[PDB]
């Protein structure tokens, strides 16, 4: 086509979606990880995760307001990945890398799994 | 912080949100423009437009499944702007620029209004 493109548009959209999350605006699901609860937008979760994409395209699960993750999933690993989904920023540290990689493999977040594998190989 | 960043994340999120829109997945509102109806995600509309942001943060309007725009709004101008919201690409042409600028001013999409003003000034 003959379109023009606004370079910062996608980043600005994601920044505003994170502002809505921080104010709990139009969040339509609670993700339960052990005792911890995380409010989010189903669409953002689907856009970032192969697991949430499969869950919310399912005719029965698409209507659930509560999703419970596997008890093996670490709440801190999930929190770091949820923050990444809404910001493009991953808080990857020596003390959390194993929990982050395991959670990203479960959530099916291919690019996060790849950088965790590379950072682990380096050490 | 000591975060790492995935450059393509925001663009990949927006691309997936557009894929959900094209398949009509988790769309929660219909925008009526004259006779034409457009299905969309409230969160994406809010992230892109000052008008939708004001509408869906309103305690009564946040629950509406149908929003009717001012009858002066041109359906083609709205369609071009809705496509921009989900792609970062604006189909700006000599024959649509006036309708696009008027719709962007109404929707409060500041960056679109700025490029329309610049393209009009040049001609």
């Amino acid at each position: 086509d003959s379109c023009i493109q606004f370079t910062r548009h996608a980043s600005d959209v994601l920044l505003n979606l994170n502002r809505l999350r921080s104010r709990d605006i139009l969040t339509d699901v609670v993700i339960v990880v052990s005792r911890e609860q995380f409010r989010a937008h189903k669409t953002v979760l689907m856009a970032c995760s192969g697991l949430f994409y499969s869950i919310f395209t399912d005719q029965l699960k698409c209507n659930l307001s509560v999703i419970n993750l596997d008890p093996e999933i670490n709440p801190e690993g999930f929190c770091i990945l949820l923050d990444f989904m809404y910001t493009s920023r991953l808080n990857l540290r020596e003390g959390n890398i194993m929990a982050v990689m395991a959670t990203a493999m479960y959530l099916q977040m291919e690019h996060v799994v790849d950088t965790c594998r590379k950072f682990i190989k380096a050490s | 912080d000591s975060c790492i960043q995935f450059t393509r994340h925001a663009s990949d999120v927006l691309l997936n949100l557009n894929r959900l829109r094209s398949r009509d997945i988790l769309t929660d509102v219909v925008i009526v423009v004259s006779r034409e109806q457009f299905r969309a995600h409230k969160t994406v509309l809010m992230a892109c437009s000052g008008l939708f942001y004001s509408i869906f943060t309103d305690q009564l309007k946040c629950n509406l499944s149908v929003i009717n725009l001012d009858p002066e709004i041109n359906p083609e101008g709205f369609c071009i702007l809705l496509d921009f919201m989900y792609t970062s690409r604006l189909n700006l042409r000599e024959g649509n620029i006036m309708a696009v600028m008027a719709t962007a001013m109404y929707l409060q999409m500041e960056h679109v209004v700025d490029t329309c003003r610049k393209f009009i000034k040049a001609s």
């Binding site: 379109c3 023009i4 493109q5 606004f6 370079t7 | 690409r89 604006l90 490029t115």
Partner: peptide, 4 residues
Amino acid sequence: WVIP
């Protein structure tokens, strides 16, 4: 704005 750019030419994509």
